[PDB]
Amino acid sequence: TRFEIRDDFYLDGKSFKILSGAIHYFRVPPEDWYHSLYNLKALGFNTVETYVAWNLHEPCEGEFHFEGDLDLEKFLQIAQDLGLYAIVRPSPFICAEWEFGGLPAWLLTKNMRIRSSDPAYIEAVGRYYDQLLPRLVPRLLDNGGNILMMQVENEYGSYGEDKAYLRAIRQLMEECGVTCPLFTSDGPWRATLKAGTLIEEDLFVTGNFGSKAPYNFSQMQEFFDEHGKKWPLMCMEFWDGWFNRWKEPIITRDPKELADAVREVLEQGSINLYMFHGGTNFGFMNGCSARGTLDLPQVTSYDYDALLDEEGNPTAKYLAVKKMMATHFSEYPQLEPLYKESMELDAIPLVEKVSLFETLDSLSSPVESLYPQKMEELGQSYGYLLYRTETNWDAEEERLRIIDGRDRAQLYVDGQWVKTQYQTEIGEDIFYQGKKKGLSRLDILIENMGRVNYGHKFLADTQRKGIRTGVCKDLHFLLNWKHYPLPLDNPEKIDFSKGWTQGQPAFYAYDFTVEEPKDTYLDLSEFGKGVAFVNGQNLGRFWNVGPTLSLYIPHSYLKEGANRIIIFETEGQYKEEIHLTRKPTLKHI
Amino acid sequence: TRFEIRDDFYLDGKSFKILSGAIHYFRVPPEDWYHSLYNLKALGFNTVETYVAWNLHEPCEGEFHFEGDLDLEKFLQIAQDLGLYAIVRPSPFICAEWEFGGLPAWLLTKNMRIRSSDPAYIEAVGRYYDQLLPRLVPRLLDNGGNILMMQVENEYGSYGEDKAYLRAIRQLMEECGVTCPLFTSDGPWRATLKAGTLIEEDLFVTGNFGSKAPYNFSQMQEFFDEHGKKWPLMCMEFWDGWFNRWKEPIITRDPKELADAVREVLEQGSINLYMFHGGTNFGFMNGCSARGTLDLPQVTSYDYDALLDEEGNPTAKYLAVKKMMATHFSEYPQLEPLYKESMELDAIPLVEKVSLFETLDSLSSPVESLYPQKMEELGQSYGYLLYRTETNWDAEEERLRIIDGRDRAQLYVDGQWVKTQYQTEIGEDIFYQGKKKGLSRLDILIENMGRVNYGHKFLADTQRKGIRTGVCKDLHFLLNWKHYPLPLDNPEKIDFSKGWTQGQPAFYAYDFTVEEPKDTYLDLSEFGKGVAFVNGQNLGRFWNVGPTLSLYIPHSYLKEGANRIIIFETEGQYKEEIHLTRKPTLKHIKGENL
Ligand SMILES: OC[C@H]1O[C@@H](O)[C@H](O)[C@@H](O)[C@H]1O
Ligand SMILES: OC[C@H]1O[C@@H](O)[C@H](O)[C@@H](O)[C@H]1O
């Protein structure tokens, strides 16, 4: 065996220190995989680590995708070609500040206990592995690839103590032909280590933490000694920055201090920098944090204050680590990192616009039923959902209430905006004075702002989006609903020839020519809320609450010559022109 | 046909004004049905009205009960023998300040949309109707009984607009032989009347309100006119008082004002006083109000400030209405009302006591599973549910959290109380310094304090009681649970020979002898919280927050000779003896009115 875990890591009979950086293939465009992997190599590090996102690879049950932006095999091959080893964490649940922690949303339509030894759930994970694992097994080092070892579950000690669950996953991997060493990662204290591991069954244990390697490793060492294990020390996630959430201030970490904290790990064991290069949560795939009953959604940018910025350029922190390495670990060869240049344009004018209500039928085909349905039971995972019904008014003024809706609701009557309610505001009284004669159109646009990816709210009832109970008018729930799923995966269907109306959700088109594609940032600091596309590719979410006020556009999303940017904006605040900038626009908080 | 709804109510061809009073057979001991019905007749009224509680008659799916306390047929026979007509409202949902609006809790384990045209739900209502309605059909006036008409659903306009649902309920009733007139009742304004009725299919419409009969009846009249109906006006629930909730002050209504308000109703049409006699929510059958996301549980006493008090004696309000009737409707013959006498017994000493933990095994056979289960999925509808696990402490102090538990939780570690959390407190961090070595016993006692009986929270996730997600220790959910369902319908299984410990839920027994059984009130003002039994009969809940601090004990619950009260108290607060009083003990809360 080329890679062994004993009293130490051994690669080809020789003692080996793992120097790893996290780069999620699904967060960096494929055209920059080489760039980012090169820059990890140039740091003097020897290994790349990545999660695998189940929700991306099986977006609908039984429908699998492993090409293009999802070509994990190619990501791994470029790594090997650059002479990098790999650690893969293929857990059904990856946390990762990622939608539903990586779990497919269609699971919410299933009768199963997600993330447990429930066989209904295990079976699903099995079918997923039946597709994923055969692609990774040939890429094990022993088999001629570069994969050193793989993770079982992910910080399971911060969720449960179901050992049968951990054993089931390990078993599934083994019988699919995974013969490399397997391991768990957890918080480095007793409670999480006990609950999250199979140490008594010889399953390798790693710790996750972002400082104080000496103390944390000692807790790990004490745990190993307790079980008679003579094992190397590895930090499977050394949090070197952090993620950002809407409305919350961007907080960076001192490059030098991070540099020193990393040194402390390397002196005692191995490391995987989380993140090395963080990249972006394109489209609707951002995750969400929880505090008690409250959800706190995470931003589109996964810059993370990582070594490489969102775009993939080295930072003070990268340079500070390069120097810490050249000073304290000079035996590890270094190189010069690659840089990309960003481009800059001013005032690309508005060509065309259209209200959602006007282009609604080319975008979406409605589902009708007596009672309102939830997003996932309609077959939708991500995006927006429009509930439509008709009702006449039975009094000069009437009260409307959305009962058990999530995450954000905008209510219109005959096209006129009445109210917007976010999270815990949903359910509050809405008062309306409607036409005395005839049916009036009640439209409620719902947005899924990202399913919680961790902890006690992981399987809360609020994880199913849309209206779960109903909409009350006076004292009775309204019936006869038309549902328009709006995943907005079909931006080519937006009909800009139809009408536009102030104070409504709408699409705004901006055209421009590009001579040579270069990275750049869409300035959206004067738009309210929504998503943006470039040549039909969903860039992710914007929101003027900050801290981020821009969307990053990779050079590879642009095309020589004519380009089209499209902005879906829901608040009614837009601009007749857009700026593309060199540097992202930030809101001070 | 003897009874018809035309441009008026006609009985045997003659104009007829219905003078009805609500008495719920299930809220009054059967030995006192005659008493209550007689007093209704003595008022000069001609009709009694009652809901039927599905959750009482079908306590477990497929298991039906119509005897004893639930002998609705005997209640109707007593009314008839006393010369009273009857209105029955056999809606699957009755609201009624009653647990889960009368719906069986086991419906929560089914894949169905409760209270809708969902055929799964309709099929359940039908199977229940298959047992209930054949019992009432022989009792329709046309068949020699006293039932004039029956209600379809209940204020459905305060819940939905599913016309297929209403039609389904109508169809089921007809299919079972119900040929008397049918009707709906709703709030008397446009939204509720449109949503709640089948007026366009000639289903009779009635209104519920507590005042301003002239104004409320004109709203009903406009609706009728709009649909070309010349119908009599009837108030199917004239709210004459109101219910109480724990921690909330008792507010009464002036006897004269209420008499006046009733006079206004009768001047234009027919009435059904809600309640004529309210009685008692025995055992765990109380309902629950909601405000936004918050639950507001209703109290054991359904006195309601009704015309007869809980005990069933005429009140100042009864006398006010009687004087009004004597003056303004003297053509209705009256009688002298009946009064029951109450008793008092001092300092009945505590004889025996046993902590719940010590008598667990005779009360309840454990259900063991890896993940924690909710109350209904274990097969339990009412009462308490103990969750038990074992765990070792991985730090000097660890955090515990109960995730998604309702309604009230008490947590013990190795028999020692750590914390009690009610409703929204559940889920707050609990910090504990655990044993130095080995497994500790983690006990969590959950109480179902009553499912919401109305409105937007009627089918909230919180309606399923117990722990719906789990119990977190540090950052992980705990596994390996033993569940002990504690419906407490088996007080004879309490083993007072076992041990007792301070600061724990426990049972306490007080013995006494009675020569002549009379009504009386158990003073529980110095007991924390729990339930009380007399001769094995669950009187209902007590809680020292008030406003009620007693439990009414009907004479029929007592025996000539030796009697035993058992008190289950959860807070650790009890006294070495109890007093029975002639009148209830109340707690003075700010805002109260008498
Ligand atoms: O960036 C925060 C990190 O937290 C870790 O505990 C988790 O395993 C990662 O997936 C990521 O969510
Ligand atoms: O006492 C309040 C009443 O409210 C009515 O609307 C309901 O129909 C009754 O069952 C009862 O709940």
Q: For residues A541 and A530, give the distance between their C-alpha atoms in angstroms, rounded to a whole number.
A: 6
Is the CB of residue B151 below 6 angstroms from any atom belonging to ligand 2? no
Q: For residues A299 and A176, give the distance between their C-alpha atoms in angstroms, rounded to a whole number.
A: 36
List the single residue in B with minimal CA-CA distance to A474: B191
**Which residues partner with A467 through β-bridges?**
A405
Q: Does B377 touch chain A (CB under 8 A)?
A: no
What's the token pair of residue A465? 């989006």
Nearest ligand (C-alpha, residue B192): 2
Last residue of one domain, picked from the residues B241, B273, B305: B273
Most informative mutation of B49, B87, B89, B97 for ligand 2 (most atoms within 8 A of CB): B97
> Is residue B58 annotated as part of the catalytic site, yes or no?
no
> Is residue B310 annotated as part of the catalytic site, yes or no?
no
**Residue B543: CATH number of its domain:** 2.60.120.260
What's the token pair of residue B166? 């209403």
Ligand 2 atom closest to the Cα of residue B274 is 1
What are phi and psi for residue A127, nearest 5 degrees?
-60, -35
Q: For residues B510 and B526, give the distance between their C-alpha atoms in angstroms, rounded to a whole number.
A: 15
What's the token pair of residue A546? 């900050």
In terms of domains, do A157 and A91 share one? yes
Hey, of B122, B392, B454, B479, which one would you mutate to test binding to chain A, going by the most A CBs within 10 A of its CB? B479
What's the token pair of residue A361? 């039928």
Identify the residue whose C-alpha is closest to ligand 1 atom 11: A96
Q: For residues A443 and B233, give the distance between their C-alpha atoms in angstroms, rounded to a whole number.
A: 38
**Residue B208: CATH number of its domain:** 3.20.20.80
Is the CB of residue A184 below 6 angstroms from any atom belonging to ligand 1? no
Question: Catalytic: which of B58, B99, B237, B376?
Answer: B237
Q: For residues B199 and B229, give the distance between their C-alpha atoms in angstroms, rounded to a whole number.
A: 9
DSSP state of A548: B
Q: For residues A114 and A125, give the distance between their C-alpha atoms in angstroms, rounded to a whole number.
A: 10
Q: For residues B384 and B401, give the distance between their C-alpha atoms in angstroms, rounded to a whole number.
A: 20
> What is the whole-number distance in angstroms between the Cα of residue B382 and the centre of ligand 1?
42
In terms of domains, do B444 and B504 share one? no
In terms of domains, do B305 and B424 share one? no
In terms of domains, do A483 and A369 share one? yes
Q: For residues B91 and B196, give the distance between their C-alpha atoms in angstroms, rounded to a whole number.
A: 13
Q: Does A188 touch chain B (CB under 8 A)?
A: no
Residues in chain A with CB shorter than 8 Å from the CB of B478 are 161
The answer to whether the CB of B186 falls within 8 A of the CB of B154 is no
Do A461 and B461 make contact, defined as CB atoms within 8 angstroms?
yes
What are phi and psi for residue B307, nearest 5 degrees?
-65, -45
Q: For residues A151 and A89, give the distance between their C-alpha atoms in angstroms, rounded to a whole number.
A: 5
Tokens 């009064």 appear where? B339
Q: For residues A504 and A354, give the distance between their C-alpha atoms in angstroms, rounded to a whole number.
A: 10
Q: How many CB pairs below 8 Å do chains A and B form together? A: 101
Q: What is the resolution of this structure in A?
A: 2.0
Do A160 and B459 make contact, defined as CB atoms within 8 angstroms?
no
Last residue of one domain, picked from the residues B455, B487, B519: B487
> A186 by DSSP, 3-state: which?
strand
- Crossing angle of helices B119-136/B72-81, nearest 10°? 40
Q: Judging by DSSP bridges, how do beta strands B234-239 and B204-209 pair with one another?
A: parallel
Q: What is the dihedral of CA A189, A193, A195, A198, to 10 degrees?
A: -170
Do B476 and A158 make contact, defined as CB atoms within 8 angstroms?
yes
What's the token pair of residue A141? 């080092």
**Which residues partner with B411 through β-bridges?**
B419, B444
In terms of domains, do B447 and B498 share one? no
Q: Which of residues 431-450 of B touch A (CB under 8 A)?
A: none
Q: For residues A481 and A478, give the distance between their C-alpha atoms in angstroms, rounded to a whole number.
A: 8
Q: Judging by DSSP bridges, how do beta strands B529-534 and B481-486 pair with one another?
A: unpaired
In terms of domains, do A60 and A191 share one? yes
HSE of A515 in the Cβ direction (CA atoms, 13 Å)?
3
Residues in chain A with CB shorter than 8 Å from the CB of B472 are 456
HSE of B338 in the Cβ direction (CA atoms, 13 Å)?
13
List the single residue in A with minimal CA-CA distance to B397: A191
Report the amino acid identity of residue A360.
L
Distance from CA of B120 to the nearest CA of A (A): 15
In terms of domains, do A452 and A501 share one? no
| C-alpha distance from residue B362 to each of B207, B388, B443, B492, B494 (Å) | 50, 16, 17, 10, 7
Is the CB of residue A197 below 6 angstroms from any atom belonging to ligand 1? no
Could you list the active site residues of A?
Answer: 155, 237
| Residues 6+ away with beta carbon under 8 Å from A178 | A133, A136, A137, A140, A150
The answer to whether the CB of A21 falls within 8 A of the CB of A237 is no
What's the token pair of residue A520? 């750049």
Report the amino acid identity of residue B579.
H
Nearest CA to A442 out of A416, A408, A466 is that of A416
The answer to whether the CB of A527 falls within 8 A of the CB of A574 is yes
Q: For residues A429 and A402, give the distance between their C-alpha atoms in angstroms, rounded to a whole number.
A: 8
In terms of domains, do B361 and B444 share one? yes
Ligand 1 atom closest to the Cα of residue A51 is 10
What's the token pair of residue A170? 């390990």
Per the structure, how many domains does chain B have?
3
Is the CB of residue B96 below 6 angstroms from any atom belonging to ligand 2? yes
In terms of domains, do B164 and B259 share one? yes
Q: For residues A574 and A556, give the distance between their C-alpha atoms in angstroms, rounded to a whole number.
A: 26
Residue A57: CB atoms within 10 A of its CB come to 21
| Residues 6+ away with beta carbon under 8 Å from A81 | none
Q: For residues B102 and A320, give the distance between their C-alpha atoms in angstroms, rounded to a whole number.
A: 69
Last residue of one domain, picked from the residues A231, A248, A273: A273
Counted residue by residue, chain B has a size of 594
Residue B183: CB atoms within 10 A of its CB come to 21
**Which residues partner with B484 through β-bridges?**
B386
What's the token pair of residue A406? 């999530």
Q: For residues B213 and B222, give the distance between their C-alpha atoms in angstroms, rounded to a whole number.
A: 14
> What is the whole-number distance in angstroms between the Cα of residue A276 and the centre of ligand 1?
13
Tokens 């047992």 appear where? B131
Q: For residues A288 and A301, give the distance between their C-alpha atoms in angstroms, rounded to a whole number.
A: 13
> A240 by DSSP, 3-state: which?
coil
Rg (CA), chain B: 25
Distance from CA of B190 to the nearest CA of A (A): 6
Give buried/exposed letters for B352-369 (b at 16+ CB in 10 A, else e): bbbbbbbbbeebbeebee
Instruction: Note down the domain range covering A179.
Output: 1-273
In terms of domains, do A237 and A131 share one? yes
Do B472 and A478 make contact, defined as CB atoms within 8 angstroms?
no
The helix (run of H) or strand (run of E) holding residue A421 is strand A416-422
HSE of B205 in the Cβ direction (CA atoms, 13 Å)?
31
DSSP A23-75: E-GGGS-GGGHHHHHHHHHHTT--EEEEE--HHHH-SBTTB---SGGG-HHHH
Q: For residues A44 and A322, give the distance between their C-alpha atoms in angstroms, rounded to a whole number.
A: 8
Is the CB of residue B208 below 6 angstroms from any atom belonging to ligand 2? yes
In terms of domains, do A260 and A297 share one? no
Hey, of A390, A402, A474, which one would you mutate to test binding to chain B, going by the most B CBs within 10 A of its CB? A474
The helix (run of H) or strand (run of E) holding residue A193 is helix A190-196
In terms of domains, do A244 and A338 share one? no
The helix (run of H) or strand (run of E) holding residue B420 is strand B416-422
| Residues 6+ away with beta carbon under 8 Å from A37 | A23, A48, A78, A79, A82, A84
Is the CB of residue B243 below 6 angstroms from any atom belonging to ligand 2? yes
> What is the whole-number distance in angstroms between the Cα of residue B262 and the centre of ligand 2?
18
Identify the residue whose C-alpha is closest to ligand 1 atom 10: A96
List the single residue in A with minimal CA-CA distance to B190: A394
Question: Catalytic: which of B58, B99, B155, B358?
Answer: B155
End-to-end CA distance of chain A: 53
Residue B472: CB atoms within 10 A of its CB come to 22
Q: For residues B189 and A475, give the distance between their C-alpha atoms in angstroms, rounded to a whole number.
A: 11
Determine the distance from the C-alpha atom of residue A45 to the mean position of all C-alpha atoms in its chain, rounded to a whole number. 25
